[model samples]
Target: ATDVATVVSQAKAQMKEAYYTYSHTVTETGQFPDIKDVYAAYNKAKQAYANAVAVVNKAGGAKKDAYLADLQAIYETYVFKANPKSGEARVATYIDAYNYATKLDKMRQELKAAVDAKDLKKAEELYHKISYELKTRTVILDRVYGQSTRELLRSTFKADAQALRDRLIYDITVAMKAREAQDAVKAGNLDKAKAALDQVNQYVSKVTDAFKAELQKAAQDAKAAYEAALTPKVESVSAIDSTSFKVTFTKPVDKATAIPKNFSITLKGTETKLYPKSVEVSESGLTATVTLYDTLVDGKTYTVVTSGLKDTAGKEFETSTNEFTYNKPVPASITFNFNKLPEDSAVDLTKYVTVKDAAGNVIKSGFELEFTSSEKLTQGKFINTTGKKSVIVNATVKGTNVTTGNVILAVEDEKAAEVSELKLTKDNKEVVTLYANGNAFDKDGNQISSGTLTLTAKFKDQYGNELTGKVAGTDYTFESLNPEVLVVAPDGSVTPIVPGTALVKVKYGEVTKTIPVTVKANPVLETIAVDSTGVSVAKGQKATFKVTLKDQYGNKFTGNVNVTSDKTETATVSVSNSGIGQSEYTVTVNGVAEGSTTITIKSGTKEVKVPVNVVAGGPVANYQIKVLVQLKVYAVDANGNIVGDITNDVTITSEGVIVNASKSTANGDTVYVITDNETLTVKLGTVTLGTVDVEVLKATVVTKKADLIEL
Candidate 1:
């Protein structure tokens, strides 16, 4: 008849006491508490808690339901059947506790099985169950006993809820690695698969015993498959010819050991070991060649088999086969014929003879043609004698049997013919005779002008007959022996570049001749002289001047002379050459207005100057009146022309009160007075002109005039 509250409190206390005692005993002893005893205590506390809650609900006040809810929570926390929705607690009854333990064991077994088979998904699922059981069941005991009873039970397997969770995560990681390794192997990634398997193996030691063995087994299987697939296989094969074949592997191989002895030849399933003629391996060692001692039958198919060829890593060659068909052979022939060079001309049969087959096709195969010429011709030697003869040429082939005819040799004559006599001619006329001993006799002393000697040559035989041996017309070598001073033309025409002596040489076969020649320079006009340095002549009167031309050597230049005047109005110049190589010049001063000028005389490169002074002719013409005793006058010849220089010839006077003073200059004038109705007179030597009236109204009117004053 205890109160429901007191009875419920006592029941919770007793259940907690039992759970605490169970957990401590199990943890210390490394064993699970007697699960039956644990379940019995829980069941008894569960019944008491159910009674307490029912009483609280039946005696209901406003807080009656709330109080009953709190009572139910306490039952669930400390006893079994706290939450009926989830059926019963795993450790609430002896049968459920035993079943949970068995189920955990089964879960571990299945998880390991899945991992061993590399079944990641299945392993993941089992691991989830195992983790869930470890967590939820662990907390159940912890809440009931209040001191980590779940940890105590889990310690029997060397783990708690957290530890089991870690273990499950690690196991899953190992399983995932194993799965990756398997995938890598399937994808032909041996190294990647091996690395993943090795990772799985590493984690196997870290995983709890539950999954260690399984993961290790999985790692072994993955590693074995990876190792077996490490060696690459042959990719392809080919046949190069009837005697040789090539094989290509997936990767490089050992070059030294890949020999022909490691291979065999097969025909229609019949295997035969063939002798190796040559074996060649490519730089990459992935492709190799095997040549047999004898070629296979033409048009027959054969197989090349490789057996013990090893890679650089000592792995044997993947058995490979290559099939090829030998090509059929054809017959051939060779012959010869001359084309460009003659058979007897130095007998180079290789250059003149051509090789051909019976079917008219050209042959370039391995063969040789040799020439055996008679004495009329020699191999690679020119015949110096002058005549015609017959020669022969022969031929042969090295590795084939063939008959060749003797080629005909035609030798032609080539010799040096002599010239028995020679002649040197000047201007197409023979002037010298030449002997065969290089002696020359001049017909006469030949003189030539500087820069020109037109000559020719004539050739003859010993009997003085015209020879036909002249190649370039009748001229042989029309060369000037002294080219520094003379250059001759091919026609025996010689030109002297300077005044010197030179020899004209003529040459023919075994005969030479030389003609001595003298070259002189043409006389050139060097200088000119005039008889009168300055000339003074009357109007309409002529004066003479002489022009002398000389060469650079002071020799007379017998060329023409040309003379001219700068001012023709003052004086006109004329030139005339004497037949005896002298030049005479004449200058005529006209009777017009008097002036002075110069006459220039030119002959070749020489020149001379003659200054002319024109004056009045024989007498004075008239007198001009000037104011205040001023008088200006002019002298003229009979033609009434003013003199260029009147000062020396004319005189002026005035009558009746006049000053006769004179200004004696090149043009002379007298001072006179302007006497009304008076006369002035002027005279030149013994000639005179009558007086003129000096009528000057303005006696200051003065007149000035030039040297030759016009009247």
Candidate 2:
């Protein structure tokens, strides 16, 4: 075995045999080698390679070198030769077949879920995909190993794949028939849905309960809805009054035909048949109130009848004849207003008793008021009563229907007195003042030395000649509304608290008197102070400057502040009072044009000036297109203002795929159409506007084989 030259000879012979088989297949059968012959050639070549390597390991220098050179030549020239079409062949690697089996196993598991969910479209798509993958494997394996995938995929088509294939077929058959009934529900043809129902029932016996129930219920509901729309009918009828009646229908009806002439009313056992004067229908179109001209007698029986009323569906309503007795319905009522005279009031029967019958008809001639008391008016004339009392009048209706509506008429002796006058007056010389002598804020305040009010309240009684004075606390109480600004005592003594107005109250005999009081602040004038002495505002913008008010004991007063701009053309001055009675005020100056101005804010005896510089330019913003998936571009600024003017200034550039930066109008957006995905590097000269992602797809190019990876 260690004889180097002998081993080399045997290896050369084996290598020559593999070459003969490959060439023989190429010349005799086809360039597409026979798998069995190629296998035979590969085994012999592998053995020859192993044998040559063994001799090189055992032999010495000269023989090892010569034998290795001859073996290397045989290996390169026969097995991995540069030209395959000439006379060479490649042995099977079996890696691609292993990859194919892995792909098929994945598809089988995915198909199981699709079938379980009864997803016909998904299952159908997966089945066709299996066919494609299998077909593709056969083609690749045929070129590489010169054999059908049937040889490679024998174990691949086993248990899991067969089960997936069987279930997919079953689900498609069942789901197809079930979908027919579901579509029929949309068509709303009850008969067609029921027909589909029977067909589905024939096969869905083996299906899950959820699937079977959904199919059957959809068909049943469709038929039930059709049956409910059959027709309309009258629901009820009632007597509204002696002269009118009402009728109700089943569903909403058209109001135009639901009128007076469509209904009728008649008195039982009489020749009198009445037609309505007015018929008012309900907003729901379900009921109608029928009013007739001639009234029916109270307690008389009548029949209200209607027929052939139609709804919006043009369906006929059921005919109805309902009997009702009018016991003179309670819609008839009496109403009157009574006024008592101030003195021993006089009662007058000259104003006759008015009566309204059950049909709302006035009956004046046959109705009279019979005074039930002995103090009666003679000859039904006006008479006076000395005492205060209430008497009953038996008011009878018109002579044809004698019914009494008993009423009470009141007589008065005189009016009982309550309070008539409630007034507050300043009687004592106790005062609170802050300004100039003897006046309020009008004449100057803190040093005014004005008269303070020691309040007093008065109440005068009226009616029954009762002009008596009211005592405090015997009838009412005293209170102050704003206790922080002023305080009041039960004797109407008021004390000023703060520099504001207050309402003082006095209670006397169920009457309360309120007097408005004033409290002035210290009237010492001082120089005005401001928060900002200078402000820089943009054109068409506003800036605010605060002015500190005159403070007396920490109470700040506005002191009637006034604001004026020195240069009105540059800026305009205005003031808003954002403070209460004692607080600082703010002057808002608006920039009229690009210039400088001085705002003079004056309060009482002092004034301050604020310098205003109105600039020409404001915070500037640039434009870029809003990145969206449309074929064109649109741009907006930070404030969302459209900067379409920058369309000509902006430019578009990109890498990776071909892109067109085309534009139509001068101020229009630069429209884009990209060949593939990545991004478009939009720029406005050197200053980049923004980037937009086309995001359709990403691709690369391989101009040469080096453009692809070597490993």
Candidate 3:
């Protein structure tokens, strides 16, 4: 008897251990427990709690409190159904743990709600009460006989000692491999799936055949039948709902063989059409979602019957059926009431109420909660009941329902700048201050916080020249405060000697921005030095005539100075934008403008016209309408030295229209022609077309008349 009892106790312990292992496997499987079971367990727990409370209340005084505390302690202890063979407790512990956890969570939420309601006093009071209740209460208590619930449950059953470890280990290995193969197949790795199947089947057969190896041939056959009956199926079929189904299959056959090109499915007396049947099937299982395409009206009841599905091998399928009422998406109407909260108003910061759907589901961890606050409310600030200000809007949805509460809007005002009095000052001079209530106003239009009045003289003289200088501070200088700053100083300084006068301006926000001042200057002649005294060039060539303008003391007079030639009646010249002495082009004595100098130009070639050709040709058109003529000119230095080849444009006039003749580039020759009707244009380079003749004539017209008449 003692040995029997010991064996029984040992069996119970092993079962408990097995249960624990099983639960862990369940977790690894990530399969949800029956939701119906969950609801039932919750209800039972609530009923038990209520009953226990009643019993405690029946008792009097501190005795009732003590009884309630003791019972609560019992409730807190994890009570699990025992399984001895596995030496682990049943899943009851996990279920009860989840329940208690949820209860505690609910209580915490209630307290949080109080806090979020801006009921600070209530929140604090409740917080303290709950804290004390949790801290002061005992977690567990043991009655003499009623203690050891685990042991009591374990003692009730003496389970048969079936060694399932090898079976389970074998099944799990095969299932996992089969799953791997299925996954590979689904992923389009046909070769890999085939390889994986061979491995899986080999191992599975090895494990199962081990048991048969020990049996007599005939006995083995009989035992096989028994094992087949008792062994769990590798494949599982679950009809999740009327419309959804999860079909899990194993390698009863090579999983690859189960793939089908086309699947003909039928549901409840209706022939369903499934196209592209041969699944690029994955091994573990195939999840096929069939949308009815036809939507169910609200409150529609439909029972979908499903069967006759065949795998790739044309094997008939196991079927399951579930009836679920069809429901259209429910449109939830929400009305938001608005109120402009005071500047110091308080709002509640309650814990969120996580809403769940019928499906057992949760969002991936770390997703930010999404929620909308009183966004339409013009106010930008919202205070919660907890007296905390909340400005962010979050629309958090857990599972299928939106999480509620804990959002606030804030009130905001756009900032504007104020403008005041205006003033002016010259650089290095006193400020002409404009007064607003006996104080000076700044460029910002504000009264000078602590600065004295400053105004600098700023103005342009009647010559349209700016007499201002650089400011002392940053790039920005108040024109009204330092008019001399308007001058361009080499060192960016406001010097009295700086040339140029500019209007003094003060820019304030939006208004009171500008002030101008009159300025006068003393005209001074700049001493100039030419790079070369006797400028020499070919008649048509260009020379860079660089001249430096300076003060009488020989220092560089870095100001805007104009250059002119004593005899510009013979030269054409112009300046471009490169600043000084870069590319000044001089043509002849005709192109020089009054303010422009031949000495310095911004950029490009400067043409100097000193033609060297000395013979003049007749302006006549020949039979080919080509006219050849040449004119004489001298290519020389300013001192009259005859330089060799020169380049210049020749112009001819006929019928009162002037046309450009050919340009000459050689040392001694020139020609020009005047044509009758066609427009003539000429272009020249520096080296070729030497001392040339430009002929303008009717190259293809009735010029025979001109020829005959001339003859």
Candidate 4:
């Protein structure tokens, strides 16, 4: 029913008008639109855009189609799904909705700011203007048909309108009290002005900055004028020292009249009228200090007379004179210059104490002074009754009871500078290891070695200070980098495990000592045994036999053990498995054809022989497991927590120690029994899962104790 001209006109009115809403917001606020805003925009703007399409489509003109191009581009760029199917809107539709809501908030804020600042005129004007704009924003889009209001006006705008009105009332009421305060200040009455100032302050809890500041100035003027109008009189006149005295006025005095020449000092028995050398008045104009060229005699009563001094209002006072008696000053306090003093400090008192007299003179000597403390001096040292780090020393000037307040006397803390000539000894008087500045190598290139088991340790702090009085863990700490070869406990004791060199690091405070000792290996063959000494296998078949090696330390021997076959054509022998603390040294012997052969295993000087008997058979049934070989593994503590990684290059063979595990798995997913005093390492391999030790109770008892090797 609408003509092509009207249709195009209607399309433009709705189309670009909606887009302009988006464009306006782009310049006015942030552009992020909520999804809820997106859907309403899409459907609603699409409805209007549909109108443009129909009109432009029916007309089919170049100008019309080109005019409709841009908003169409914006419609599909960003998207969200929603109802009211009218086609689709370029995201411009939702952008309009987004900006429209933000405008309402901004509009409410304009009014809120004016009200908060107590700009009553601007607030009243904005209340009417922004409310219209708030309503005007709704007409930007026809929401009843397809778009939604998003409830922004009621949710965000209504409450702010009430706040604007409320503060406007506050501003008006405060303005009335401020005017009354200003009026009373001009009336020249103290009680009236003060009463009005209190009322102005009471009414202004909710006020704006400029108005609040203006009322403060009014209060200031009122109080100052009231104070100036009082009859001026002297409050007190007192001599601070022999040379200067201060005068206090009943009210603030006139600074222009308070000068040196107006004041004169005289004694009743003397005819000398001494004039002040200089006068310094405080900013308050209430107190003035007058300095004299000559000091007043002690115990002498002198009269200070004033002439032409006026109050702040320039009201001249009657002639006045006040008499003050000067007293000889004594030391007021002392400052101590004590540092680097031990708890038993008994040095000269005059060297540390500094005393200043009441008249601002430093008394270098002849003032009785001593320090008092709760911990009395014991043989010149302040003995600790409470053993506190710092002692409170109260120093006083004896006769006057003048004190230097409470000064803290902190005792110097001493630390061992260095570990002097540490030596490693096995048996008493026999030094097994010597140190050249805490190292194993001496000046002559000769060295001392250590043996297995515990080594007696001896050392002293720098300056040959005896270490016997110091507690092990409290005064010092001991550690070893060679944890695999040696274990150093917190008790300052070292124990060697294997036949290897170990470096022990001892630290006290900032000083450190490194003791590197070569441990004797004495490698002995402790174990050379096998299961029956003979293994059997068939052609293309294999069998497994267990072999274990233990070192002189009595754990699993990790030394290289070689295995060889005498006749390869008959059978071949190879290592199939190994473990951490436990061993399956589990080896496999492969059979070729049907023949006999001898497989011999040798570790160090120890050797054992296993004869292989092969018979006729088929393909292999189970995969052959390999002998335990060297592996990179970490260590675990007794509590199942990992101590660290790669303590010792131990062995993890083809099979695992899972069959010998206690119960739970530890760090690195390795199943291990809790490390005991002797066994300090662990790991779980492919054949093993997890195990350990925890709380013991019924229904939770794991039998067999896992028989895991305690190596």
TM-score of 3: 0.18
- Stretches off by above 4 angstroms in model 2 are 1-369, 372-383, 386-412, 416-711
lDDT of 2 by residue, 318-369 (tens): 6777787766533232333343322333555424344466788654322344
lDDT of all predictions = 0.56, 0.57, 0.36, 0.57
CA RMSD of all predictions = 59.2, 25.1, 50.1, 32.9
The TM-score of candidate 4 is 0.21
In candidate 4, what are the lDDT values of residues 545-639, reduced to their tens digit?
Answer: 77777656554545666678888888877885432333437778877767687888877677888788787654323221111212123333433
Better of 1 and 2 by TM-score: 1
User: Model 4, which residues run further than 4 Å from truth?
Assistant: 1-526, 529-532, 576-586, 618-711
| Candidate 1 wrong stretches, greater than 4 Å | 2-33, 61-70, 80-151, 159-183, 187-194, 197-285, 288-711
Write down the TM-score of every candidate.
0.25, 0.22, 0.18, 0.21
**What is the C-alpha RMSD, rounded to one decimal, of candidate 3?**
50.1
TM-score, model 1 to reference: 0.25
Q: Per-residue lDDT of 1-711 in model 3, one digit per residue for the tens?
A: 233333333333433342333244344553434535544544454455556566556545665675566445433332232321122122344443333333444555665465334333344334444444344421211111122332322232111101222233453455445556655634545566546556665665554443333222323333233333331222443333323333444323334433343233333344543232233334433443333323333454444333445444434444445444433332121112232222333432122223233464432221223445643322322333233333544444423354444545443321212223333433332333332223333444334454333443233322223434424233233443454434333222322323344555432223224555334333232454443433433333344444455544344444432333444533444433423442222222233222223333211222222221212122222111123234333344444434432223423222244344444545554444333323332223332222222334322112111110010
Clashes of each: 9, 10, 118, 20
lDDT of 4 at 551: 57
For candidate 2, the lDDT comes to 0.57
TM-score of 2: 0.22
